[PDB]
Amino acid sequence: KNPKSDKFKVKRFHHIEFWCGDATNVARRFSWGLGMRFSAKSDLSTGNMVHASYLLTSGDLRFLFTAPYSPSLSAGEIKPTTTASIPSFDHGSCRSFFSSHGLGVRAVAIEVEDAESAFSISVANGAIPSSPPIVLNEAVTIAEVKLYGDVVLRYVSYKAEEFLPGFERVEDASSFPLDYGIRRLDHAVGNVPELGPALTYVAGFTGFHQFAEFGLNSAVLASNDEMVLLPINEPVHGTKRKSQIQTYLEHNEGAGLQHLALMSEDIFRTLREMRKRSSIGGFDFMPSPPPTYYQNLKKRVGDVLSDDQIKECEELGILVDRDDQGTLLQIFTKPLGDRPTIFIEIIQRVGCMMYQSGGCGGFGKGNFSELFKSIEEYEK
Amino acid sequence: KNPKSDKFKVKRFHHIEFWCGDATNVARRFSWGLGMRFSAKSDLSTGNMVHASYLLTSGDLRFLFTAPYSPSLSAGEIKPTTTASIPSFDHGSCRSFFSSHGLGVRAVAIEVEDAESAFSISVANGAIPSSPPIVLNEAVTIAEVKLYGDVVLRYVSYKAEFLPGFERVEDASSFPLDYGIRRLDHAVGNVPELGPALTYVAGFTGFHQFAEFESGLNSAVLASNDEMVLLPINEPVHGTKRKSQIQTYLEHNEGAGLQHLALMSEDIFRTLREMRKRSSIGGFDFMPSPPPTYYQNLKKRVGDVLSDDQIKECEELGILVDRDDQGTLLQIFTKPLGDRPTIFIEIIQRVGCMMYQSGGCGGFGKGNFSELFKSIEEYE
Numbered sequence: 184k185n186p187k188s189d190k191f192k193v194k195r196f197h198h199i200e201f202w203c204g205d206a207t208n209v210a211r212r213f214s215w216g217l218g219m220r221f222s223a224k225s226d227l228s229t230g231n232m233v234h235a236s237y238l239l240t241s242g243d244l245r246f247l248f249t250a251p252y253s254p255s256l257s258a259g260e261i262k263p264t265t266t267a268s269i270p271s272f273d274h275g276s277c278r279s280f281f282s283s284h285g286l287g288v289r290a291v292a293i294e295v296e297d298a299e300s301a302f303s304i305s306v307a308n309g310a311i312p313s314s315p316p317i318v319l320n321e322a323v324t325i326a327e328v329k330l331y332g333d334v335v336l337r338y339v340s341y342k343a344e345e346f347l348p349g350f351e352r353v354e355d356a357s358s359f360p361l362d363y364g365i366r367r368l369d370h371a372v373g374n375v376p377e378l379g380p381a382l383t384y385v386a387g388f389t390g391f392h393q394f395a396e397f398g399l400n401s402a403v404l405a406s407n408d409e410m411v412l413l414p415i416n417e418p419v420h421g422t423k424r425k426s427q428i429q430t431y432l433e434h435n436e437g438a439g440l441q442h443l444a445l446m447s448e449d450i451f452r453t454l455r456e457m458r459k460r461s462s463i464g465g466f467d468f469m470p471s472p473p474p475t476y477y478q479n480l481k482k483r484v485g486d487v488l489s490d491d492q493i494k495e496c497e498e499l500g501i502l503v504d505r506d507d508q509g510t511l512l513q514i515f516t517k518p519l520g521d522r523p524t525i526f527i528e529i530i531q532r533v534g535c536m537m538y539q540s541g542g543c544g545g546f547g548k549g550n551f552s553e554l555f556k557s558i559e560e561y562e563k
Numbered sequence: 564k565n566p567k568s569d570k571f572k573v574k575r576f577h578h579i580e581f582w583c584g585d586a587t588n589v590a591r592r593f594s595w596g597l598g599m600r601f602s603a604k605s606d607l608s609t610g611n612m613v614h615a616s617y618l619l620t621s622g623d624l625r626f627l628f629t630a631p632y633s634p635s636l637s638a639g640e641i642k643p644t645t646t647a648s649i650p651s652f653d654h655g656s657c658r659s660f661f662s663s664h665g666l667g668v669r670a671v672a673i674e675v676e677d678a679e680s681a682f683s684i685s686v687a688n689g690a691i692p693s694s695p696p697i698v699l700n701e702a703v704t705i706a707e708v709k710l711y712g713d714v715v716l717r718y719v720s721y722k723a724e725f726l727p728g729f730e731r732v733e734d735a736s737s738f739p740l741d742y743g744i745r746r747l748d749h750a751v752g753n754v755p756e757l758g759p760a761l762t763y764v765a766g767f768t769g770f771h772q773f774a775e776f777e778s779g780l781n782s783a784v785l786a787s788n789d790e791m792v793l794l795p796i797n798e799p800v801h802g803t804k805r806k807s808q809i810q811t812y813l814e815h816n817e818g819a820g821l822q823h824l825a826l827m828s829e830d831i832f833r834t835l836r837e838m839r840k841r842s843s844i845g846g847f848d849f850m851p852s853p854p855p856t857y858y859q860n861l862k863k864r865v866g867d868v869l870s871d872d873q874i875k876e877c878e879e880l881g882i883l884v885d886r887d888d889q890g891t892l893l894q895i896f897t898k899p900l901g902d903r904p905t906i907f908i909e910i911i912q913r914v915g916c917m918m919y920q921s922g923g924c925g926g927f928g929k930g931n932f933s934e935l936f937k938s939i940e941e942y943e
């Protein structure tokens with residue numbers, strides 16, 4: 184049941200911004216590992232004496248990597264005379280974030296009809312303001328409110344119908360057209376110490392509604408058309424094995440973004456391409472489930488995948504779960520950096536064809552049961 | 564002439580340690596871009612709750628990449644009970660280094676016969692102590708003195724993997740890349756004043772000035788007894804038409820530090836082919852190629868050393884060639900390794916001075932300043 188109670192006009196996920204120590208090395212690693220193209224830059228070569236920012240794109244997916252230069256380069260500037268292309272940037276905020284959290288997501292950005300309006304209604308509805316609406320070259324408006332921890336939900340709106348003003352397109356020579364099938368951001372998942380207040384706060388200022396489905400507790404906030412999806416986890420203390428949400432909070436120094444789910448238009452090509460590169464600069468994957476798991480998928484999704492595609496799931500380590508309206512293919516990378524905090528999920532959804540409706544197949548809630556049952560039958 | 568005035572026994576370059584914000588991402592980018600294998604780790608998975616350190620190797624070349632975890636993980640520890648594998652590591656020193664300089668070299672490590680004596684005689688002879696000698700598992704001794712800026716010269720000695728507490732990387736995770744890079748040839752620092760820098764360093768090491776043979780800078784080279792440890796030092800020349808890039812280094816780096824690392828390849832042509840293949844898919848970019856006239860003038864000076872077939876290969880790969888009276892030098896420079904116009908890498912191969920090859924054979928390319936200004940005027 185979808186009340187469609189959005190308090191302002193939300194369109195889609197627009198980009199994800201990583202705050203880094205060195206944007207160059209993180210970005211080049213991510214480009215190779217994920218098959219994303221360098222598509223825009225704002226840095227010393229574009230006149231930006233404040234921060235270095237490099238944009239990777241794959242389909243509609245936009246990963247932005249930003250790091251601070253020495254404040255001495257911009258010591259003479261003031262906010263009216265700034266050369267930063269992203270006016271919310273702050274040297275001290277950025278260095279604090281990185282030293283506290285390590286490599287991680289600073290902004291979950293959604294496009295909206297009117298960023299100034301979305302900021303005002305949000306703050307009027309309990310949102311903690313982070314950066315006030317600022318209009319960039321009379322073309323784009325951007326505004327920020329706190330989401331959880333030091334993560335901000337960023338509103339961006341365009342008068343027109345090129346990422347942001349001040350960013351230049353990167354030269355063809357430095358833009359090799361990598362592509363492993365990733366097409367768009369499906370959802371972004373946060374970890375917090377307690378679920379209730381985080382939900383009450385975010386649902387409070389957005390009007391996002393709870394999305395139904397079927398060592399943690401979780402719930403998913405969703406926009407009107409359920410294309411902006413924001414699950415949130417809290418830890419369940421007392422279990423035999425220590426909750427990984429708790430281990431997240433410990434290594435991240437509190438709440439933050441836990442993982443990003445990237446939709447692929449062909450999850451088999453994506454996993455083949457990423458797994459080719461795991462040990463030559465790309466990303467590692469979580470240990471595959473036992474073949475037990477895969478023997479039992481026939482009874483579950485033999486309706487939906489052939490024996491060959493089930494066998495191909497076993498090669499790549501893919502997981503499969505299923506709602507009452509669709510089926511979900513998913514796999515999880517290992518942590519993206521030094522700490523056991525942020526990781527990436529690759530997914531592909533099958534079913535619920537209207538285009539495809541959001542969250543088709545759910546988010547993998549069934550795979551807790553099927554993992555313990557598969558590990559218990561592989562031991563036998 | 565060479566007085567062999569080393570004040571303690573110095574063997575070879577042992578490793579170079581980068582101080583990072585995230586060691587994983589820098590290390591994986593460097594591994595792909597340079598063709599270096601992952602060979603040892605010290606991190607959470609090895610019991611290290613303080614720092615994450617990852618070692619890449621190519622031949623004898625050792626690149627160590629280190630970043631701090633959250634201090635909270637090691638709050639109960641004291642130096643006697645530390646789990647850091649590198650006892651000189653300090654959270655606050657590391658974060659201060661990285662926020663001041665960005666990505667850069669913290670330690671230039673040379674192996675010596677006895678690290679304690681090397682430290683003792685060093686500070687006895689004016690060296691500013693950085694970390695006193697510490698004996699690692701009764702096997703390795705480690706000591707550090709200040710070199711220039713926030714860079715330290717690190718002494719390592721073995722009584723008999725990399726260091727105690729570093730584990731070998733699982734072969735599944737250790738893919739055997741190799742583009743021909745074999746060892747560290749020399750390491751170059753930029754300082755605001757050359758004279759006092761040389762006086763200091765030559766002062767406490769006993770290294771002697773290595774003899775070589777209007778634009779840029781002034782520089783000089785300190786060398787160990789057998790001239791295998793080579794440390795050039797630069798200072799800017801102010802007042803010129805074009806900004807001294809030593810001066811631009813100092814500004815963007817917030818003062819003195821390591822400018823570039825020169826890596827010896829056993830086949831510069833293969834190395835440059837392999838690196839240039841990956842420039843746009845996660846690797847390193849190279850400085851603009853010299854004009855074709857630079858290569859037309861190569862026959863008159865090195866036609867005696869390289870065939871037309873080897874001179875043509877130099878021009879497609881952008882390699883530069885210089886020559887003193889004892890040997891011939893092939894060299895090329897990368898673009899900066901990260902966000903700031905500070906540290907970069909040089910690939911080199913030396914031709915001649917066999918008796919082994921003796922150090923510095925062919926010089927360091929000082930003649931390429933006259934030949935680059937010439938060629939630009941001829942191609943006009």
Ligand SMILES: N[C@@H](Cc1ccccc1)C(=O)O
Nearest residue numbers: 751782795796797822927928
């Ligand atoms: N002049 C130093 C290093 C350097 C190289 C290139 C540019 C500036 C400085 C040398 O001995 O090679």
Ligand SMILES: [Co+2]
Nearest residue numbers: 372444528546
């Ligand atoms: Co998910």
Ligand SMILES: [Co+2]
Nearest residue numbers: 751825909927
């Ligand atoms: Co050099």
